[PDB]
Amino acid sequence: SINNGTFDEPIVNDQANNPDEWFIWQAGDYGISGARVSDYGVRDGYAYITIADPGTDTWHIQFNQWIGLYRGKTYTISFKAKADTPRPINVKILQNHDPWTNYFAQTVNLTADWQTFTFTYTHPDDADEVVQISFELGEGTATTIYFDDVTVSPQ
Numbered sequence: 527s528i529n530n531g532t533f534d535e536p537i538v539n540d541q542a543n544n545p546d547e548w549f550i551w552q553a554g555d556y557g558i559s560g561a562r563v564s565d566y567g568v569r570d571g572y573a574y575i576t577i578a579d580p581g582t583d584t585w586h587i588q589f590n591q592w593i594g595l596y597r598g599k600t601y602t603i604s605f606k607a608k609a610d611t612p613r614p615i616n617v618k619i620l621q622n623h624d625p626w627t628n629y630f631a632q633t634v635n636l637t638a639d640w641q642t643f644t645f646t647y648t649h650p651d652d653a654d655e656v657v658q659i660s661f662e663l664g665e666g667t668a669t670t671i672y673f674d675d676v677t678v679s680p681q
């Protein structure tokens with residue numbers, strides 16, 4: 527399941543050695559675009575991520591964690607989110623390697639007020655057993671985005 531979904535502990539950000547804890551990937555680090563996060567952290571029980579350059583596609587900035595799920599089983603995906611200026615983000619369940627098949631994908635419009643978003647999800651019979659949750663923060667307005675109470679739980 528999700529580790530540090532309440533944000534009582536710092537964001538680890540070590541994709542190479544601990545991808546099962548929260549990490550950020552940015553396209554600017556890979557010669558793909560200018561996509562860059564200037565600051566991130568936790569305070570008062572929530573996560574914040576400050577975008578300096580959003581890149582040119584939604585996946586150019588990702589806030590992700592690997593998770594194990596059972597084939598054929600139904601889950602609930604839930605999270606709280608907001609942003610200093612109104613804009614969209616995506617939420618996905620996808621493979622953690624090429625070809626990055628998206629098993630679940632939705633877009634949500636954020637405002638300056640905290641709101642909650644909750645979706646049912648059935649893991650496909652032939653999906654990989656280890657996948658990742660991904661919040662895609664690229665393309666849209668450069669601003670600060672906030673998260674809290676992220677869960678992926680059996681129905």
Ligand SMILES: OC[C@H]1O[C@@H](O[C@@H]2[C@@H](O)[C@H](O[C@@H]3[C@@H](O)[C@H](O[C@@H]4[C@@H](O)[C@H](O[C@@H]5[C@@H](O)[C@H](O[C@@H]6[C@@H](O)[C@H](O)O[C@H](CO)[C@H]6O)O[C@H](CO)[C@H]5O)O[C@H](CO)[C@H]4O)O[C@H](CO)[C@H]3O)O[C@H](CO)[C@H]2O)[C@H](O)[C@@H](O)[C@@H]1O
Pocket residue numbers: 551556557558585588590620625626628
């Ligand atoms: O070593 C060579 C190379 O390495 C670079 O470094 C590595 C870097 O690539 C890797 O980044 C991961 C990142 O890619 C991943 O983002 C994925 C994103 O790739 C994915 O893109 C999809 C496309 O895959 C899909 O394209 C295909 C299409 O073009 C083709 O014609 O048809 C196919 C159909 O059969 C179709 O699949 O196309 C869509 C466009 O609609 C793209 O969206 O999209 C998903 C989201 O859906 C996104 O997650 O994110 C990972 C983290 O989750 C990144 O890790 O990262 C490694 C280390 O982290 C690097 O090693 C260098 O930059 C280059 O210089 C080198 O040459």
Ligand SMILES: [Ca+2]
Pocket residue numbers: 531532533534570571572674675
């Ligand atoms: Ca919290």
